[PDB]
Amino acid sequence: YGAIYSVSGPVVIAENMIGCAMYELVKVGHDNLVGEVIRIDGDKATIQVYEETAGLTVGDPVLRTGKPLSVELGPGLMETIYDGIQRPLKAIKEESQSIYIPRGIDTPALDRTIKWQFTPGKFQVGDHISGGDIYGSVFENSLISSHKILLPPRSRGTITWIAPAGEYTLDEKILEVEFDGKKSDFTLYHTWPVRVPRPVTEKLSADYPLLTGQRVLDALFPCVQGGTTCIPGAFGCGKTVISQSLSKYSNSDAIIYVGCGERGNEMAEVLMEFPELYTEMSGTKEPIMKRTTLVANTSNMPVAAREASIYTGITLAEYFRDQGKNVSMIADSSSRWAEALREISGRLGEMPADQGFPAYLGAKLASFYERAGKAVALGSPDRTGSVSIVAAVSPAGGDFSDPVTTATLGITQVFWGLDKKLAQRKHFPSINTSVSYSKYTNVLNKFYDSNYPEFPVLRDRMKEILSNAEELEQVVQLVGKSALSDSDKITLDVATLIKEDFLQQNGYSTYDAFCPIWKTFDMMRAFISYHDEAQKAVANGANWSKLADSTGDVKHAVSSSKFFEPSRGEKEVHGEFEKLLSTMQERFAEST
Amino acid sequence: YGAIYSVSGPVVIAENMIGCAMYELVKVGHDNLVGEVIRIDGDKATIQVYEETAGLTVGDPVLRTGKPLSVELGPGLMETIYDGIQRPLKAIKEESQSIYIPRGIDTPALDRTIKWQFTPGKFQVGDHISGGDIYGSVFENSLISSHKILLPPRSRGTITWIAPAGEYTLDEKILEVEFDGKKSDFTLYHTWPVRVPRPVTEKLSADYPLLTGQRVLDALFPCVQGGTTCIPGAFGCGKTVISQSLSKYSNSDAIIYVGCGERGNEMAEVLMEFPELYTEMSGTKEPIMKRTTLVANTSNMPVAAREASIYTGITLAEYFRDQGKNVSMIADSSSRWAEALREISGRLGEMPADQGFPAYLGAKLASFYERAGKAVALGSPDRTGSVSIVAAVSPAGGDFSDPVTTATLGITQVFWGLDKKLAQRKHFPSINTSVSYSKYTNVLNKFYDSNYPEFPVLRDRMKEILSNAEELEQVVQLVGKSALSDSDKITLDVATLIKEDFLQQNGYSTYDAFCPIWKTFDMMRAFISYHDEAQKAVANGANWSKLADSTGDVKHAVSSSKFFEPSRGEKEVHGEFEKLLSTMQERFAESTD
Amino acid sequence: NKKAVEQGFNVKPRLNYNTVSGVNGPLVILEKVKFPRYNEIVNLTLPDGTVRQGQVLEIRGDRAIVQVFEGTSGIDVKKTTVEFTGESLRIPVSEDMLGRIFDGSGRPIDNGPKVFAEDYLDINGSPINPYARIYPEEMISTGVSAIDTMNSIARGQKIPIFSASGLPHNEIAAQICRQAGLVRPNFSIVFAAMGVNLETARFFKQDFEENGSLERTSLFLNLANDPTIERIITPRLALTTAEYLAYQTERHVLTILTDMSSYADALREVSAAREEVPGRRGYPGYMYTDLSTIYERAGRVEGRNGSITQIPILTMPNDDITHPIPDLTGYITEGQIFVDRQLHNKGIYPPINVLPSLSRLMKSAIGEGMTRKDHGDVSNQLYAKYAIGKDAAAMKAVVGEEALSIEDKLSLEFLEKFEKTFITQGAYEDRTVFESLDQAWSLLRIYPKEMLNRISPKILDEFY
Amino acid sequence: LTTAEYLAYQTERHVLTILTDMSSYADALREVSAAREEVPGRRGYPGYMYTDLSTIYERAGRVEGRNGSITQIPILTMPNDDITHPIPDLTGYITEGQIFVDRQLHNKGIYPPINVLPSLSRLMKSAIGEGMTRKDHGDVSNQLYAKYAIGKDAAAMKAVVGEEALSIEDKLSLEFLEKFEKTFITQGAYEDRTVFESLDQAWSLLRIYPKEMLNRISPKILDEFY
Amino acid sequence: AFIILDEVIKVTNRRVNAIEHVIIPRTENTIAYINSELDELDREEFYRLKKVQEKKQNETAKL
Amino acid sequence: NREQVFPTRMTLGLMKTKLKGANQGYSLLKRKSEALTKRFRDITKRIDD
Ligand SMILES: Nc1ncnc2c1ncn2[C@@H]1O[C@H](COP(=O)(O)OP(=O)(O)O)[C@@H](O)[C@H]1O
């Protein structure tokens, strides 16, 4: 064991540590404070103590752990709250009986007192097992049943003994491996270095969309499973709406919500809102908490925990991807993580890059985002999981010139650009269609042309009509609105109809919330078919005002098409649209 | 001989080196890499190495040569390309049989095998010969003929034996001076420390213009033979092309092109283009390359060698001035020298000045630019040489607020500031007429009075036109052209014509590669006369809108005057310009009648 | 014959040092080293068995400052064995690389065998003798008109592509890579992906296979998830392979170094670890020389038919030319193909903005027999009228179309039919230089001969 | 904050911690951070000032098990009235609102010199409600802010397009702004106004406009009040 | 009144467009440049202080 | 594209205040143009009558 030699703020220099590697967590002091080895110098080892460092007398024993910053992956991490350093907040509250976090508390990250129903997999004794191979399954909840038990990715060998089906707790030998001698003695959980990306067999192309459920996000600026997005995350812009929509409606079978440095009462709001969120799964109404874990991390928490929050969240999402479950990691205010990184760099004395951020900010951001993507999980049996990152960017000072925002916008392929003015205009979800973009549209052709063929052409048509509507609005601001042509007036009216009954979605109404892909495609078909019929009628020589007066009924039907309840099923909804679309074509023709 | 003790990029702190002087030259490493001492701390003397330090090992012997960085001067300097240190690139390539610069090549600075036709000077045996006296001329080439062999500036005494006329190699003794009983043997070549400026009898005011041949330069911001010049500007502005069009066609007798931190293909272009151009001077069509020597230290070649390349170039220029030649040294990318200094200081750990540069950058640049200037040579016979320095400062990011640019503007008397915005439009040479200046305009009155008396008047008149129209265009860009008067509209049109047909000079074109002083003066007169006569016509009552259509022919003839090839002769082009002026006057008279 | 290889047919033992006297950031400081060699690749052996390479950077007597490419995470003082190879980093090159996919450090990742080396070459390379250089006068019929007729590409040209974060630099660089061909008579290609995301890596690795180039392209893919410092040696490895191919097997190599801004960021993240002089914007002072060591490994050499073209794709941060990476890249290289965010938003492909674009080898490789005699004058006239159109468009946006003169209205028409019918081009549509010049003349015929103040009278008479 | 934590969690009572001159606290942090050998950060203030201010601010808020609550109102001095200064920037990041004291208002002589256009409270919607304060508060504050912004715009517009050319809404809004800054924001140093009395004064101000001009007010609120 | 008002409207719209497309872009670019220059100066001062701190720490270690 | 103002903290503040003033003047003049063009439309209608 080591010993303290010098303390100066967070950094602790410990003597008698020959044999400690960098980034290895060492239990500093008598209270077993956790700290990471920053640098070594002979027998000394500079340690960055995570928690408050006041009260460490020199000579205090420092225990080595031998592992880098590690996240404990296993059954039981679902439906529980962690900090950045993977400390279970609920367990800390229960154990300490104090509303604070006691200094140096070491409650294990996974409840070792819980008994799990382990059912062994196809692997039997004498069968070669490699890292990532599934040898069991644990019924963990009602939403994430069949929680697989992977072999640790860096471990390989041959099975010498596998536990039979039954009820087990963690830290209990569930399987033993012999590899070139010695034994493994694995448990239901394994620890993984957080900063090291989890290995996969192959990183596939992200060809399947992440249906957020919102019409605009699922139609105009789509996200693919395994795709990385960005969100302005302004005060009241609707980031809460986007995160809740993803969590309770997205295709992802597991959600990781990391709070890397957000305000304390904002975190209280999140922690009191997610348990109240109920996701209607296949069976019945089930809590969204059984599929979502939260790395809740207020700005009071240690700066090392804040800087490692996103890494811990992405490692949990990677672990769930290795189980074949599509994950949707949501990062809240990644600029706060960047600020934590800047604070750590300032402590370490590293020279500043652009705008004071550390030199490796872009490198760290790129290496973190590159973990997101649909990848075939390591080992047998073959299974194709995915991790998709939805990281709010939360610009510093309300400007998109910050280096963290620039790097995030250069790395992420989707930017759902929430606008404060749109939010104030009561136009939920406040998605500014003129700044938002998604570079996954080209890739999503392999899915659209297979499921809903006309959908990309429809989306391009509405992007064109919205740009033309912006131009027409500029023209009508410059001069009188009556100076516009009949075609321009028809385009402007259709675009206003779109902005009022297609993009603008109520998150509380039963009909409006969670518009599926089929309903979105059918509504898009209806809207653009109405616009095309109006354009054809205008080209036929009919007056625009008279045509609008005659086809007001068709316009009302188109606008009310938003209220077509998706609960009736895709077959019923598609049939309703065909009748609704047929009337629009008929009325817009005979009215001339 | 010491030993290497630490290597960190281009610094080699060598231990066991008691006795090495500052700026002494050492042979660091087994390959005998050339290095200079810059800091001494007891035994360990910190060495900067003018060669790739990769592969150096601690304990590699370093030999103290006992002499500061010395460039060999004499015949054979001309028509050759050199590395940063004085090494011939041709000889290096032929010795290595390869296309790479091997580490530690020690080829002789000047070709020893080639024999030169030495012809003794006025000095006879027994006559006292002081430093810098001429005791013979060697026939270098058809253009730099009579490469007069100076005595070393520090050498003095009486001649004991001077070689008779004939053919001699450089190693052959040519003259032996007896001084206080200690005879010293002199040859065709003499080494010289690059840091130490070559002595001269007395500097002189530079009263003759370095005719760059480019209209904007030698008509608005003249440079005199012996004046420091600076060409700031971002990448693509045209500093290198201005430098090349100056070294291709200036009136300088000899030229020392220095590619301190330049591109390799630029030096290759010079090597293939200079032999294909001929200078009308010396009464024959001798090639340009017979009068230019090149010091190529490209950007990727060792960082420390950039300073050596600059100092070697300026020392060669100083030697050719002491000979009596109007040299024009061109330091391409002089900011790369500043960056080399910054890199070496960063290796040393020295405290930085503004923007990473060392605190002595301004002093080094000032001492380098003070080497220029017309000066009477050191010894008999009376000689009046001149060194003109035209260094292209390359600002970081295109902003002239760079420390190297400021420390260069504080010392240079000319400032040919280039504009990136004009560079983009191919408006070339893109000289920013707003900020560019030349402090030699007052000095050049004594020359413009003797030749082209109206030149200064036209220069101030065109500067007035350009400034007035720049201010007017600035106003119009925000207030519209509605409020302009007819005179203001004429000023706008005339200055647009000036910028697009006179100031712009399309180099790499047959007609406008070299617009000499007489054609520049005639074109300048044509433009000024067009402006003055248009303003007189509008003052006479003729509307400018109708006058533009009436005199489009005259305007196009004026704009097409730049197409008069200067090769037609001074008499021919002057006659064509006189005819054009007569046609212009007749056209305005007919229009205003 | 080849007796040089036999001289290296020997065995040399290596010293394994378990004497790591500390480590700080990416720097491993050794001790008790026996005659350390500056810049010697060193194979560390971590306690867990992982082998991390590293090269010595400072050799203060009996001590070596070893920087490890893969990072120091996990390096222990009492367990790591640091083994000195005794020679600078060398890539095993051969003619069999062409068609293989390598990792950032050159270790193949295409499930293929190790490179059956024909020779080992130091990755740093050596400065080509400027007397041995040849000025590249052989113009490349790139296919894109905005490059072929303006900002022309010669053979040994080293002309980077400047582009913003989201602009289609990869699509353009693939089009240049697939259509490039000498105008008046294929290119072996060498790739170096530095920090590109998997989407871009797969796009290039698939476009090469689609066009059949992959039979003659060696890829050095150093993605985002690869170690940050390995991006320092990835372009040196790619250029050393390209230098071997071109200057020794006499092939014409078209080197592509994607995301050079990632390499510059790697330089900054390494320099900031050594507390070096911070240059400008945090990039090290020596970054000019660091980028020059990369870019200058291009151009033809005397006596050898090979030639290395470079197209280092660059991602300008915030689309600013004044940034240190694009600024120093413009100073070092011999051109730039400025891909414009404004043009991309306008919808033009390729979004090449010719005004900031440049090519310093276009004063050569133009005219006479290299191309039509009208090329040199027509390109300048197009530049002049494009700039006039841009200025008149600004004046129109300020004061209104009523105040635009006849020349300004002509400039607006020329600019419109220029951006929308001359810069624009199909992704797979290649235009010969003669056809591009004919389209340029069709555009120029908007103006009368009088207004074309840049075209020489002879060229106007012969071609207008 | 330790006194606040004690009295508000160990004891069951509410606390309103008021911290004065966080600029002085930041200067003190700078003095100690440079009392060591640490290099100054972004503006002289240490690079870890975000953590050093978060550890002070965040020790507040309601708690599940305790009936007490710490509410912080850190008084803060903006040097040169620059919001982008590190202390105001970090306090804006960590805290949950911004109350601005306006130099222009103070010079005009409006005590207390709060300008409500920039100032906001994120958690207002959790405080103003039916059970907390009058049920009109949510609509009244929004209408008041909108009308104050309109009045500021009209006051700017009068000097350029004449007083008589303003619309009826702007003409009423000028009088509303005058009777607002002179009566509502203006408040004696010893004048304590209950939230209900402040809302009554707000309604007395809002009665200037016709019932159809109060766009932001809900129709039910207009029917009950006004 | 029509002619005068039309002239004044043309002048005012010209000024509005000029402010929107010249003054605001020029001033925003100038703010960006000045902020970048100030950041560069702060970085240079940081490097100088870091060098001073390194020298002081080395001297303290040597003592 | 940018002025030649020497970068200093005082200059940055002055130029930020200038930007705020220019934005306020832009909004004011846009609203003035809107009011005067409404009056211009009214005057045109009266001219026709
Ligand atoms: N006077 C000129 N005439 C013709 N072309 C020029 C002129 N000046 C510059 N150029 C062009 O500029 C390019 C070289 O610019 P250069 O001088 O190298 O700028 P930099 O030194 O900043 O790189 C060449 O392609 C050449 O065509």
Put simply, the chain E residues between 1 and 60 with a CB less than 8 A from any chain F CB are: 1-2, 5-6, 8-9, 12-13, 15-16, 19-20, 23-31, 33-35, 37-38, 41
* DSSP output for C357-385: -EETTSSSS-STTTS-TTHHHHHHHHHHH
| Residue B258 · residue B292 · CB < 8 Å | no
| Enclosing H/E stretch for A385 | strand A384-392
- Tell me if A369 sits within 8 A of A410, measured CB to CB: no
Vertex C427: Cα angle to C422 and C430 (nearest 5): 65
Residues D13 and D7: their CA atoms lie apart, in Å, by 6
CA C25 from chain centre, in angstroms, equals: 29
If one counts every other C-beta atom within 10 angstroms of the C-beta of residue B78, the result is 20
C27 φψ region: left (φ > 0), alpha (ψ -120 to 50), beta (else): beta
How would DSSP label each residue in F1-49? --------HHHHHHHHHHHHHHHHHHHHHHHHHHHHHHHHHHHHHHHH-
Q: Sort out which chain D residues have CB atoms less than 8 A from E46's CB and list them.
A: 39-40
Q: How far apart are CA D85 and CA D82, in angstroms?
A: 6
CA–CA separation, F29 vs E17, rounded Å? Answer: 10
In sequence order, which residues have a C-beta less than 8 Å from that of residue C197 and are 6 or more positions away?
A: A366, A369, A370, A411, C223, C224
Interchain pair C278, E14: CB under 8 A: no
DSSP state string for D172-221: HHHHHHHHHIIIII---TT----HHHHHHHHHHHHTTS-TTT--SS-HHH
Bridge partners of A254, per DSSP, are: A327
Atom number, ligand 1, closest to the C-alpha of residue C331: 23
Output the residue whose Cα is nearest ligand 1's atom 13.
Answer: C360
What is the C-alpha to C-alpha distance for residues C77 and C68, in angstroms, rounded to an integer?
15
Q: Give the DSSP H or E segment for B119.
A: strand B116-120
Distance spanning both ends of chain D, measured CA to CA: 44
Whether the ω angle into residue A199 lies within 30 degrees of 0, i.e. cis, is: no
B563's CB contacts (< 8 A; 6+ apart) are B511, B512, C456, C457
Measured distance CA(D4)–CA(D68) in Å, rounded: 10
Instruction: Yes or no: say if B46 and B13 are a contact pair by the CB < 8 Å rule.
Output: yes
> Which amino acid appears at position A230 of this protein?
C
Distance CA B43, CA B29 (A): 17
Give B346 to chain E, closest Cα distance, Å: 10
Q: What is the CA(B243)–ligand 1 centre distance, in A?
A: 10
C42 vs C65: CA distance, rounded Å: 11
Q: Closest-CA residue in chain B for C247?
A: B99
Measured CA to CA, the distance from residue B455 to residue E60 in angstroms comes to: 68
Q: Measured in angstroms, how far is the CA atom of residue C149 from the centroid of ligand 1?
A: 17
CA nearest neighbour of A253 among A149, A325, A150: A325
Q: Which atom of ligand 1 is nearest to the CA of B508?
A: 4
CA dihedral C188, C194, C197, C200 (to 10 degrees): -20
Whether cis (ω within 30° of 0) applies to the bond prior to A403 is: no
Strand bridging mode A33-41 / A24-28: antiparallel
Q: CA C379, CA C372: separation in Å to the nearest integer? A: 12
Distance, CA of C316 to CA of C163 (rounded, Å): 6
Ligand 1 atom having least distance to the Cα of B332: 21
The secondary structure of A149-187 as a DSSP string is EEPPTT--EEEEEEPPSEEEETTS--EEEESSSS---B-
Inter-CA distances, A322 with A201, A317, C104, C217, Å: 10, 9, 26, 34
The answer to whether the CB of B176 falls within 8 A of the CB of B161 is yes
Residue C356: strand, helix, or coil:
coil
Q: What is the dihedral of CA C239, C243, C249, C254, to 10 degrees?
A: 50
Task: Determine if ligand 1 sits within 6 Å of the CB of residue B508.
Answer: yes
Cα–Cα distances (Å) from D8 to D3, D18, D56, D127, in that order, read 8, 14, 16, 19
B336 close to ligand 1 (CB < 6 Angstrom):
no
- Name the amino acid, one letter, at D83: I
Answer whether F17 touches E (CB < 8 Å). Answer: no
- CA A208 to each of CA A378, A415, A448, D91: distance values in angstroms, whole numbers, following the listed order: 20, 18, 9, 42
Q: What does the DSSP 8-state code read for residue A356?
A: G
- Pocket lining: B513 vs ligand 1, CB cutoff 6 Å: no
- Cβ proximity of A431 and A232 under 8 Å: no
Rg over CA atoms, chain B = 27
Q: How many CA atoms lie within 13 A of C57 on its CB side?
A: 16
Residues in CB range of C237: below 8 A, 6 or more apart: C91, C102, C105, C106, C123, C192, C220
Question: Which 8-state DSSP code applies to residue B431?
Answer: B
Amino acid found at C27: L
The three-class DSSP label of residue C74 is: coil
* Whole-number Å distance between alpha carbons of A34 and B583: 93
Distance CA B26, CA B65 (A): 5
User: Which residues contact residue A397 at a Cβ distance below 8 angstroms, ignoring those fewer than 6 apart?
Assistant: D84, D89
Paired with A392 in beta bridges are A231
CB C93 within 8 A of CB C117: yes
Contact (Cβ atoms closer than 8 angstroms) between residue B477 and residue E21: no
The three-state secondary structure class of B72 is strand
C113 near C41, Cβ under 8 Å?
no
Contact partners, residue D219, CB within 8 Å, separation at least 6: none
Torsion of CA C20, C22, C24, C29, to 10 degrees: -50
- The residues near C376 (Cβ < 8 Å, ≥ 6 apart) are B508, B509, C363, C366, C367
Contact A126, A135 (CB under 8 A): no
Type and span of the H or E element at D30: helix D22-33
Is chain E adjacent to chain D, meaning 3+ CB pairs within 8 angstroms? yes
Q: Over the range D25-64, which residues count as b (16 or more CB within 10 Å of their CB) and which as e?
A: bbeebbeebeeeebbbbbbebbbbbbbbbbbbbbbbbeee
| CA-to-CA separations, A111 to A88, A183, A272, in angstroms, rounded | 9, 25, 22
B329 CA from centroid of ligand 1 (Å): 19
Let me know the angle formed at the C-alpha of C58 by C57 and C64, rounded to the nearest 5 degrees: 95
Nearest to B317 by CA among B240, B241, B385: B385
Q: Please give the structure tokens belonging to residue A579.
A: 């009748």
Q: Which residues of D touch F (CB under 8 A)?
A: 80, 82, 153, 156-157, 160-161, 165
CB of B235 sitting under 6 A from ligand 1: yes
The two three-digit tokens of residue B297, written as one number:
């230290």
Cross-chain CB nearest to B477 (options E22, E44, E47): E22
Backbone angles phi, psi at D6, to 5 degrees: -55, -65
| Vertex A228: Cα angle to A222 and A229 (nearest 5) | 60
**DSSP strand E in A296-383: where?**
326-331, 375-377
Question: How far apart are the C-alpha atoms of A7 and C257, rounded to whole Å?
Answer: 46
Q: In what order do the strands lie in the sheet with B147-150?
A: B147-150, B134-138, B116-120, B166-168
CA of C356 to the centre of ligand 1 (A): 13
Maximal CA-CA distance, chain B: 93
Q: Is F29 on the interface with E (CB under 8 A)?
A: yes
Does residue B1 line the site of ligand 1, with CB under 6 A? Answer: no
**Which contacts qualify for C182-186: CB closer than 8 Å, 24 or more apart?**
C182/C138, C182/C139, C182/C140, C182/C141, C182/C155, C183/C138, C183/C139, C183/C140, C183/C141, C183/C370, C183/C371, C183/C432, C183/C433, C184/C369, C184/C370, C186/C216, C186/C252
C126 touching A, CB under 8 A?
no
E50 burial type by CB count under 10 A (0-12 exposed, 13-18 middle, 19+ buried):
middle
Please give the structure tokens belonging to residue B113: 């095998």
Nearest to A45 by CA among A73, A21, A66: A21
- Ligand 1 mutation pick, B237, B241, B273, B420, max ligand atoms within 8 A of CB: B241
| Of the candidates B116, B147, B150, B121, the residue with the CA atom closest to the CA atom of residue B133 | B150
Residue C68 to chain B, least CA–CA distance (Å): 16
Rounded to 5°, the CA angle D169-D172-D176 comes to 125
Contact indicator for C256, C214 with CB cutoff of 8 Å: no
Which residue in the block uniquely carries the two structure tokens 């939403």? A143
> Two tokens at E56?
């002081």
Which of E40, E46, E50, E58 is the best mutation test for D, with the most CBs of D within 10 A?
E46
Q: In whole angstroms, what separates CA F30 from the centre of its chain?
A: 6
A487 CB neighbour count, 10 Å cutoff: 15
Q: How far apart are CA A19 and CA C78, in angstroms?
A: 5
B236 within ligand 1 shell (Cβ under 6 A): yes
C358 CA distance to ligand 1 centroid (A)? Answer: 9
Phi, psi of A245, deg, nearest 5: -60, -50
What angle separates helix D195-206 from helix D168-180, to the nearest 10 degrees? 150
| Alpha-carbon radius of gyration of chain E | 26
What is the structure's resolution, reported in angstroms to one decimal?
Answer: 3.5
Edge-first strand order for the sheet with C101-102 is: C101-102, C217-223, C188-196, C252-258, C307-310
Cα angle, residue B325 at apex, residues B321 and B329 outer, rounded to 5°:
65
- CA distance linking residue B48 with residue B62, whole number of Å: 12
What are the structure tokens assigned to C271, written together? 């320099």
Contacts of B485 (CB under 8 A, 6+ apart): none
Does any ligand 1 atom lie closer than 6 A to the CB of residue C361? no
Closest by CA position to C414, among listed C432, C433, C437, C388: C388
Strand partners, B278: B287
DSSP string for residues in B4-67: EEEE-SS-EEEES-TTPPTTEEEEETTTTEEEEEEEEETTEEEEEESS--TT-BTT-EEEEEEE
Pairing of strands B326-331, B254-262: parallel
Residue type, position A434, single letter: S
Chain D and chain E share a number of CB contacts under 8 A equal to 11
Contacts of A354 in chain E (CB under 8 A): 39
Residue A561 near residue A523 (C-beta atoms within 8 A): yes
Q: Is some CB atom of chain A closer than 8 A to the CB atom of C278?
A: yes
- Which of A20, A359, A409 is opposite residue C272, by nearest beta carbon? A359
Percent helix, strand and coil across chain C, each to the nearest 5? 35, 20, 45
Q: So where are chain B's domains?
A: 1-69, 70-113+187-438, 114-186, 439-593
Task: Give, in order, the Cα–Cα distances in Å from B234 to each of B335, D132, F5.
Answer: 11, 65, 19
Which residues neighbour E15 within 8 Å (Cβ) at sequence distance 6 or greater? F29
d(Cα A136, Cα A133) in Å, to the nearest integer?
9
d(CA C77, CA C70) in angstroms, rounded, equals 17
- Residue A16, both tokens: 């008698």
